[PDB]
Ligand binder design. Structure first.
Ligand code: FMN
Ligand code: FMN
Ligand code: ACP
Ligand code: CL
Ligand code: CL
Ligand code: CL
Ligand code: MG
Lengths: 460, 313
């Protein structure tokens, strides 16, 4: 009585469909629903008895055609897109969902398909690919930029799998350590380079990095070639699936090497000043004290400081490179040689002495000569002062020797005191040379002997 | 052995399809292609012998259900959209394409429908509109990771667009020069700090940067505040579409003038401390004329020697 409803499905549905017969020769379209003929534009008889192949053309990819024909003989289904041309020739994209109808025996008997004009994704490919290409070329620009800032500037780059301990070391990182460009790295291999003082800090931090919290370490290493390097390292664990700790490691040696030296400059200055400020600790200790002549004790102070400030300018012909005894023996004893012209004699080699001794020199020179004018040989008319110094030896060393000899003076009696010089000599002149100092009050003249081992804080 | 190619053509198509049986109570469903059990996620035994009504729900415009019930009654086709609900509960538009099946006399025997989801269709225009921006975010992610490394490693970085002359200056680069955190830098702002005796060298190899030939240069700048600084600039040229000149700069005013630093400091830490302590002790020159000044003229001097030893502690 009544028809088959499944034909009314394929007949009325707006989905273009097709049936073909692979027992008829060359698999011809036996059925074409009206939608397939609204899609293609051809007429009912024009698409019957022919093979679908007729929709292809010059732009139709002859590679897709192989893929379909392959599966048809395989008797397996196939989904694929291909170019087709409307009856008016207007090409479109045709998506084919092609399936093989088997019967009860298991032998093929029909092919069925569903066709769709998926020429909307054509503009979707042109949009998506044109953009996501120029955007992955935008990235390729900011790759080479980052890559270059790491060639230069030497930026190390390491990772540690927080769960397993797997490590990755970038080339600059391997360059910063003493590492072969391709040997395996673990926490192991790095810590074996950290100086023993700084190990427990590294361990405590590498076992701390569960917090996902950016830490920052400084630690020194000793490369496999004996070189020593300071390192800053900033890390920050990225929690997630495989928790990686990501770290930056850069070499900060030239900064550290130059920091801990620029402080050494102002370190000695803070030592050459609690010695020079406390140098006048003695110059004012004795001079303007409880004297019978506070008016003349500043006639003397301004004369013993006019000589200490002479012990500062000798270090200007040479950049504090000490001075020569040949120049200092002229520095402090040229004012005397005005009145006592050619009555003080200097004998010795052209030598060299550290600048923290050239100060205690031009004072002991100026002080002892002042003693010669008061009590000693530079007081009378025909007194003379003999200064001899020469490098010689006794107990195997190459030690230093000098003599203050006062000849043709007045007979030297004995001192009833032991004033400022007699300890300016034993205490801040012997402790300026590692010296063994001596004084004899011979009746003939003042005999002063000095003996100093060579330790280039005294003899450069 | 004689299977139907039509019974198999709907069997396999991806268009949801229904065939109902009006000559039965309630006009129930007696066929649903698997393309229907996907669209509604229901099992097989869950849509057979039950009216297509059961897909409707609480948000279904009833004036729609009226014209559908009306066309069914009058044996007409209908092409309408209606809000239906999946087995999950998803609120999705449903495009009903319904047709009558009139037998060989003109007598309503069957009803057929091809269902079309206009929620999976009308969303793919915004399912990859959210993909065009995932790939616009990976791009901005990589220009960021650059910016991120330049910060954490505190690196003085600069980029001169070779054609245009536009420049970008990293933070540390702007701190090395005497530069505002965000002032517009070009080549002038960097040259106006160069000392006269080094401008030619800066210029000579700033035009010699065209040929992708990496170059290093040292030169002095007098900062805006008066500080003099030595800088080593290592630069290059990436030749892509528009060539970017890549360059790094670091303050070396130390590895340079440290011979003079250590020297010309003692040349003034004694130049003005011999000069500076040779007169503060001329104050003991202005306290001595009476007696017992080693009792008060030292209470008027020892308060100046740790007034300078504490001015540096
Ligand atoms: C049911 C069915 C429908 C097909 N529909 C089309 C079609 O619409 N457009 C098309 O180019 N090819 C279609 N084909 C593929 C062609 O029929 C043919 O197989 C293709 O051109 C490759 O095979 P051939 O090299 O022997 O021609 C269809 C195939 C089958 C089995
Ligand atoms: C072939 C066919 C398919 C139908 N498919 C749906 C459907 O998918 N969703 C829906 O809400 N209604 C569908 N209907 C409509 C409902 O079954 C029915 O018309 C609705 O309940 C309104 O009639 P009523 O007031 O008697 O319930 C379909 C009707 C037919 C004849
Ligand atoms: N060149 C010399 N020749 C002989 N005797 C000397 C001498 N220099 C010092 N004396 C003797 O040693 C004593 C103390 O020597 P010293 O020079 O250290 O103190 P002083 O009396 O000169 C006070 P001040 O040293 O502060 O000027 C003198 O009084 C003197 O007897
Ligand atoms: Cl670490
Ligand atoms: Cl049936
Ligand atoms: Cl430049
Ligand atoms: Mg004396």
């Amino acid at each position: 009585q009544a028809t088959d409803p499944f034909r009314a499905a394929v007949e009325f549905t707006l989905m273009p469909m097709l049936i073909t017969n692979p027992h008829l020769p060359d698999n011809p379209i036996v059925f074409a629903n009206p939608a397939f003929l609204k899609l293609t534009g051809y007429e009912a008889d024009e698409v019957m008895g022919r093979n679908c192949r007729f929709l292809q053309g010059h732009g139709t990819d002859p590679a897709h055609v192989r893929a379909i024909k392959s599966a048809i003989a395989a008797e397996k289904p196939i989904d694929i897109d291909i170019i087709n041309y409307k009856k008016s020739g207007e090409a479109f994209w045709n998506r084919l969902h092609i399936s093989p109808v088997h019967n009860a025996n298991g032998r093929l008997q029909h092919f069925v398909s569903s066709q769709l004009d998926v020429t909307l994704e054509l503009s979707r490919l042109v949009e998506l690919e044109k953009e996501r290409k120029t955007l992955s070329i935008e990235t390729a620009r900011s790759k080479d930029q980052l890559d270059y800032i790491v060639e230069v500037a030497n930026i190390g780059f390491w990772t540690r799998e927080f769960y397993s301990g797997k490590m990755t070391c970038s080339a600059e990182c391997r360059r910063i350590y003493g590492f072969t460009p391709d040997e395996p790295v673990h926490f192991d291999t790095i810590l074996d380079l950290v100086v023993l003082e700084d190990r427990m800090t590294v361990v405590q931090k590498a076992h701390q990095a569960v917090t996902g919290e950016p830490y920052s370490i400084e630690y020194r290493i000793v490369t496999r070639l004996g070189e020593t390097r300071w390192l800053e390292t900033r890390a920050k664990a990225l929690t997630g699936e495989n928790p990686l700790v990501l770290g930056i490691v850069q070499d900060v040696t030239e900064r550290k090497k130059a920091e801990a030296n620029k402080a050494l400059v102002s370190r000695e200055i803070a030592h050459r000043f609690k010695n020079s400020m406390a140098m006048v600790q003695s110059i004012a200790n004795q001079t303007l004290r409880n004297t019978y002549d506070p008016e003349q004790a500043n006639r003397l102070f301004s004369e013993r400081l006019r000589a200490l400030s002479q012990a500062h300018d000798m270090l200007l012909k040479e950049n504090w490179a000490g001075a020569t005894i040949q120049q200092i023996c002229a520095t402090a004893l040229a004012p005397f040689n005005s009145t006592f012209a050619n009555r003080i004699h200097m004998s010795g080699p052209h030598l060299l002495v550290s600048d923290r001794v050239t100060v205690a020199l031009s004072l002991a020179f100026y002080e002892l000569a002042t003693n010669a004018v008061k009590y000693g040989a530079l007081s009378n008319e025909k007194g003379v002062i003999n200064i001899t110094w020469a490098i010689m030896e006794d107990k195997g060393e190459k030690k230093f020797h000098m003599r203050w000899a006062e000849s043709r003076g007045p007979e030297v009696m004995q001192p009833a005191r032991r004033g400022f010089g007699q300890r300016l000599l034993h205490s801040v002149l012997a402790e300026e040379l590692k010296a063994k100092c001596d004084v004899e009050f011979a009746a003939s003249g003042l005999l002063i002997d000095v003996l100093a081992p060579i330790t280039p804080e005294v003899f450069p």
